[PDB]
Amino acid sequence: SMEQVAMELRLTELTRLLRSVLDQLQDKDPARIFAQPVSLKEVPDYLDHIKHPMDFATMRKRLEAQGYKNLHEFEEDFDLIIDNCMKYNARDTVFYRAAVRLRDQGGVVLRQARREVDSIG
């Protein structure tokens, strides 16, 4: 149907906008601490601690399959990255501190993204 196509164009354009959001958030992680999945070879107990691992490569795979229906879903995954790190790692660690800085800096990007998603519809 023509409606299915219109819906699909909306999803494509959301995907375009979320790709630019993802790029901007990942620039706030210049150490690449959150770029890839925590390695279960190197942290073999990880899944005992963290039930839903997340990272920027995994988000990018979902994004490119158009697997985010709305901004809320995308934000859910970003918050997992931060929240998983802040639980697994102690306050005094470069990992925790990186997550805090990513959260604080990302807030700005995500605030305007929400306005754009609502605005353009």
Side-chain angles (χ1 to χ4, degrees), residues 1-2 4-6 8 11-15 17-40 42-60 62-68 70-110 112-119 121:
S1 74
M2 195 48 235
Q4 289 299 311
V5 170
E8 295 164 355
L11 176 61
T12 298
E13 286 304 299
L14 175 63
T15 303
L17 178 157
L18 293 182
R19 188 177 306 112
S20 166
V21 176
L22 185 64
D23 290 342
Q24 286 177 70
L25 296 172
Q26 185 154 27
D27 290 336
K28 309 316 179 156
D29 173 32
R32 302 194 66 89
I33 290 164
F34 304 105
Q36 293 292 332
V38 170
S39 169
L40 302 174
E42 304 170 357
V43 187
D45 74 356
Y46 189 66
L47 299 183
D48 291 345
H49 290 269
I50 297 301
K51 297 299 175 186
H52 296 101
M54 191 48 52
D55 67 275
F56 288 128
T58 300
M59 290 188 64
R60 197 171 293 280
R62 183 165 166 191
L63 179 62
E64 293 311 335
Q66 300 187 347
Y68 298 113
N70 54 56
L71 184 54
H72 180 74
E73 292 188 345
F74 179 92
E75 290 176 323
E76 284 197 332
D77 272 355
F78 177 65
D79 285 336
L80 277 176
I81 292 176
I82 299 318
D83 289 341
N84 287 348
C85 185
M86 291 174 74
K87 293 169 190 67
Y88 191 82
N89 304 106
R91 232 161 9 257
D92 72 330
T93 63
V94 61
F95 309 106
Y96 185 114
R97 289 162 173 284
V100 166
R101 291 166 60 83
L102 176 61
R103 190 199 60 185
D104 287 348
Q105 296 195 277
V108 181
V109 174
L110 289 169
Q112 202 52 41
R114 162 54 63 206
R115 293 190 67 82
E116 286 176 3
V117 168
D118 293 357
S119 189

